[PDB]
Design a protein around this nucleic acid. Structure first.
Lengths: 156, 153
DNA sequence: TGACCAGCTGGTC
DNA sequence: TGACCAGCTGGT
């Protein structure tokens, strides 16, 4: 084993507690799909992830659904979307506002809300491309953090 | 907003310290790609990750590292679009399978290329028989890993 | 950037 | 068991 394993063992009880808090809030895996980051957004915003949800989508206390996206700005400046983007995928969240969270690594820095009207520019862009090139899936097209900060409404 | 935020703030320094430890060991995000669990496997096995979750041992041998939570599912994920190009890379290295119950690590197995060929052959044959259609995440059963691999933890 | 290159997984019949 | 249906991203 590596010598740093002892440091890991010292930190584990707290990691455990964090996973327990995540579970208490509907997140059963903090180490995948930004699970440990999602928990921060949820506790700050008041949003919830329901059992049996489709992916990282949440709802407010009024039942409104939201698509939640996370980005590590220490590494990239474009929000990922879907590995096989096409009109069917766009339809999945065309009707809901999106919550974009910006992180420096694992720590939350800001959160923005964009309404469908704010995202139409990208839905149309992707549709336009798909219709022209023989209906090919787009491999994870990105939404600029700059675009999100300019068009969205900061909520954290 | 939610009252539990204070608990999260209480736990944060330690979580950041864990992320710092992962960073020191070449893992950029403990909350993606099983980052926090891959660190544990690297620290237990002595393997290291170079600048996928692929790792290398002290002799330079590369490995594919897989992880699974056995409380939820019975089969290890492979690739969302399995085809001969992916299988070609796979055949080149042994695989390290980590088994978890929640976040509690239970065991780690090593399988040699010869021990996974049964599946590479199956996946290859199917890709052609389907009309060159990628397979969507075929699974390698935990049972298979335990019966054909060597327990290293 | 536009648009193409990548990986890490769980679920249910 | 195998076959299929899904998800979250970073990198250039």
């Amino acid at each position: 084993s590596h010598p740093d394993l002892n440091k890991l063992l010292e930190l584990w009880p707290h990691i455990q507690e964090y996973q327990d808090l995540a579970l208490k809030h509907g997140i059963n895996d903090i180490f995948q799909d930004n699970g440990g980051k999602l928990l921060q957004v949820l506790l700050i915003t008041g949003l919830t992830v329901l059992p049996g949800r489709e992916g990282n989508d949440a709802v407010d206390n009024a039942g409104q659904e939201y698509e939640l996206k996370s980005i590590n700005i220490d590494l990239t400046k474009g929000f990922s979307t879907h590995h096989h983007m096409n009109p069917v995928i766009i339809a999945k969240y065309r009707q809901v506002p999106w919550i974009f969270a910006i992180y420096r690594g694992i720590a939350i820095e800001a959160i923005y809300r964009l309404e469908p009207k704010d995202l139409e520019f990208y839905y149309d862009k992707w549709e336009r491309k798909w219709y022209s090139d023989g209906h090919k899936d787009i491999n994870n097209p990105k939404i600029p953090v700059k675009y999100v900060m300019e068009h969205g409404t900061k909520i954290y």
